[PDB]
């Protein structure tokens, strides 16, 4: 699933079957398992994918097509092809989001009063995904979901068969990529509160390099996800962590500025902020993970 392009890839055996009373025969065999060059001499339905972007039909080594004619006139026509379909995603809970990628197909040039589609078996058992058939690295296929409907176009009504594959993004990559460095940078920023107040360049470079780390983190984590125009969950996490790091630096600036005039106040604000920051960060972590894991 290419998240940056809002699309997915799927390799399928696409099977169609209809009844053609002009292809009745009577011979010793009851089924003719013919070639893939006989299917061009006869009528075959012109199914196209409503949300397919650039699909291919494999031609290696011969055209990967299949034509079977049964003695009573039934035709089975199978193709092997790679659909590259469009999956509109709502990345509001990224990277803890679930999707339903569709695959709509129907008939081009044949309205509902001419060609209708139907599933050959029970609708729950028609689209079948293989067991070892998963090239997903970032998602997890949960199941499939078929449907059938009618769309009203400028040229007539068309039967449209929809198939939804339900996907759930795996967070294990993004944890180590973004959620662990941000938390570690927040901890590295908060560890500055334990140094003595007489070493001001030390705590300064602590704060400033944590701010630098958070900025480079937000940039590196934003360049993975496509350029959406809203805030995801990872964006909110990075924003709150940046707020915590920057607030820590502001607390250090306050402690240093209050030194040499009121030492007791600086001591108080360094002792109070030594425990309020991990407490606040832990409550934020608890609330954030609770609202985005049960979402």
């Amino acid at each position, epitope marked *: 699933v290419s998240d940056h392009d809002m699309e997915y890839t799927i390799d399928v055996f696409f099977r169609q079957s209809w009844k053609d009373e002009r292809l009745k025969f009577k011979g010793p065999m009851t089924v003719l398992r013919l070639n893939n060059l006989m299917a061009s001499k006869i009528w075959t339905p012109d199914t196209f994918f409503h949300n397919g972007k650039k699909s291919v039909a494999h031609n290696m080594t011969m055209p990967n097509k299949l034509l079977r004619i049964t003695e*009573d006139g039934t035709l089975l026509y199978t193709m092997r092809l790679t659909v590259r379909a469009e999956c509109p995603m709502h990345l509001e809970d990224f990277p803890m989001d679930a999707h339903a990628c569709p695959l709509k197909f129907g008939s081009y040039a044949y309205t509902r009063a001419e060609v209708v589609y139907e*599933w050959t078996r029970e609708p729950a058992r028609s689209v079948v995904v293989a067991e070892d058939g998963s090239r997903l690295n970032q998602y997890d296929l949960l199941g499939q979901t078929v*449907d059938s409907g009618i769309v009203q176009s400028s040229t007539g009504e068309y039967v449209v068969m929809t198939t939804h594959f339900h996907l759930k993004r795996k967070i294990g990559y993004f944890v180590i990529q973004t959620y662990l460095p941000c938390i570690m940078t927040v901890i590295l920023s908060q560890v500055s509160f334990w140094l003595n107040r007489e070493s001001v360049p030390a705590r300064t470079v602590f704060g400033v390099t944590t701010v630098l780390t958070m900025t480079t983190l937000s940039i590196s984590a934003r360049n993975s996800l496509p350029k959406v125009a809203y805030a995801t969950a990872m964006d909110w996490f990075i924003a709150v962590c940046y707020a915590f790091v920057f607030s820590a630096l502001i607390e250090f600036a306050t402690v240093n500025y209050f030194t040499k005039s009121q030492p007791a106040r600086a001591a108080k604000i360094d002792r109070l902020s030594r425990i309020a920051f991990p407490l606040l960060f832990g409550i934020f972590n608890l609330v954030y993970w609770a609202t985005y894991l049960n979402r």
Partner: antibody, heavy 117, light 106 residues
Framework: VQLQQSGAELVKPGASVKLSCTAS????????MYWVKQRPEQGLEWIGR????????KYDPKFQGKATITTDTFSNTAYLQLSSLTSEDTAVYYC???????????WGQGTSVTVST | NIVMTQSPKSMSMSVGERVTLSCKAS??????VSWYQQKPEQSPKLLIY???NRYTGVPDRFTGSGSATDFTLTIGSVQAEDLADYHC????????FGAGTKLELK
């Protein structure tokens, strides 16, 4: 177009019954054939279905092992055989075929089996 | 086994008024819910095939409304010949029907 079933049966509990459903107006190799049961003043219950062009059959979990559905293509007939029927399956047995949006558009006429001594 | 729950189990209503029957599914059934009508001592008749598609020979007073789980069958001007049973059945998986609803007159 039309499905015609056989008459009612009055059998003894512990025997086997074979019900028939003859199709007129279409070839049964193009659709599925369903058997449904309906008790007096209750809802329908799906027994099982058979794909006559293949022979593949599926059954309801409360009917697996009890009923068996076969087909005769040369005369367009679907058969339902119940193996050992007890004193509770006194219902009406309908024969249906799949329709447009996987609905049962054409139904039979019902065959009311009756078990008693 | 997808269970279809139909409500109400029995109802009465007069002539020439809108009436609505509901069917609720446990699992997802896309648009594969069908509505059958069964008069006493007769075989069921398909009224609505799929969610919101009328069968050939059904009056324009029956209309269905579909969703992922919630389905309705609405009759407009209900006549005196609609004294029958109405079943909802799903076809997304191996077919299961509802319990039934007995329409009555008053």
């Amino acid at each position: 177009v039309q499905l015609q079933q056989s008459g009612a049966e009055l059998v003894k509990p512990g025997a086997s019954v074979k019900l028939s459903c003859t199709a007129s107006g279409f070839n049964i190799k193009d659709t599925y054939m369903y058997w449904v049961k309906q008790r007096p003043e209750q809802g329908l219950e799906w027994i099982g279905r058979i794909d006559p062009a293949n022979g593949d059959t599926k059954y309801d979990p409360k009917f697996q092992g009890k009923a068996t559905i076969t087909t005769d293509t040369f005369s367009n007939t679907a058969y339902l055989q119940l193996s050992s029927l007890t004193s509770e399956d006194t219902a009406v047995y309908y024969c249906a075929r799949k329709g447009l949006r996987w609905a049962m558009d054409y139904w039979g006429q019902g065959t009311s089996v009756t078990v008693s001594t | 086994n997808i269970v279809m729950t139909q409500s109400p189990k029995s109802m009465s209503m007069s002539v020439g008024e809108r009436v609505t029957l509901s069917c609720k599914a446990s699992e997802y059934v896309g648009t594969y819910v069908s509505w059958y009508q069964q008069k006493p001592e007769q075989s069921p008749k398909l009224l609505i095939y799929g969610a919101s598609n009328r069968y050939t020979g059904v009056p324009d007073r029956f209309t269905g409304s579909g969703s992922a789980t919630d389905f309705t069958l609405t009759i407009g001007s209900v006549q005196a010949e609609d004294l029958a049973d109405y079943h909802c059945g799903q076809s997304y998986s191996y077919p299961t029907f509802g319990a039934g609803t007995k329409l009555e007159l008053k």
